[PDB]
Amino acid sequence: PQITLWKRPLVTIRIGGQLKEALLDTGADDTVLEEMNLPGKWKPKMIGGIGGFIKVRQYDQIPIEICGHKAIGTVLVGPTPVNIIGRNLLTQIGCTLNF
Amino acid sequence: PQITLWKRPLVTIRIGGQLKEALLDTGADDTVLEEMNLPGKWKPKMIGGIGGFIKVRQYDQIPIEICGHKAIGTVLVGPTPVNIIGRNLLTQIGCTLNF
Numbered sequence A, B: 001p002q003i004t005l006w007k008r009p010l011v012t013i014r015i016g017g018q019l020k021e022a023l024l025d026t027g028a029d030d031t032v033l034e035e036m037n038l039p040g041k042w043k044p045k046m047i048g049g050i051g052g053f054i055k056v057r058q059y060d061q062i063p064i065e066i067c068g069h070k071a072i073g074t075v076l077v078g079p080t081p082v083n084i085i086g087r088n089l090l091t092q093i094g095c096t097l098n099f
């Protein structure tokens, strides 16, 4: 599909068993999800956005379907207002910018 | 161009006569540049992301050339590690996401 940028490019994702709305975010190196209690091991991490840094939990090799396209990789979980799909997963679904 | 996402989507922009590198960010509502001088009036504004809110200076109707494509719009100037081109200007240059 093609997604214009008139509005926030929000799409439906699936992770664990839980559809969510998430932002396709070319300016994000990583994928950051709103607080959720995912199973399995994780590592503490700091990530920095416009306001400064926040603490997150890094989970690896988590399957996540984005607009029906399967991906699997690292997801960071913490107090973000918005679910973010970053480049680590956008590449897996063959997403490009075009102009 | 078509731009893939295995690296940060950085491009050269020209603004107020000067060349800068900037990040094409579909996650950003707005365009935020590192501290710099720009001509004309500005208004204080606040903007928020991961890690919270910052103060910026809002300049309206500013010409920027982004990877060879012209835009004229709102540019915020404030503390960021990265010049950011957000949707307000990505739309002007006809940028879409595709997968």
Ligand SMILES: CC(C)(C)NC(=O)[C@@H]1C[C@@H]2CCCC[C@@H]2CN1CC(=O)[C@H](Cc1ccccc1)NC(=O)[C@@H](NC(=O)COc1cccnc1)C(C)(C)S(C)(=O)=O
Pocket (backbone or CB within 6 Å): A025, A026, A027, A028, A029, A030, A031, A032, A047, A048, A049, A050, A076, A080, A081, A082, A084, A086, B025, B027, B028, B029, B030, B031, B032, B047, B048, B049, B050, B080, B081, B082, B084, B086
């Ligand atoms: C720029 C503006 C203020 C207008 N909007 C945003 O920041 C919105 C805020 C949104 C609401 C809050 C959650 C994040 C979303 C998306 N987010 C856009 C994301 O694409 C932002 C845009 C951004 C990019 C680089 C530096 C700062 C910010 N991405 C991130 O915050 C991301 N940061 C980076 O990708 C790398 O950041 C650097 C780079 C170099 C030095 N220091 C930090 C990230 C989400 C923290 S991460 C590392 O991908 O988890």
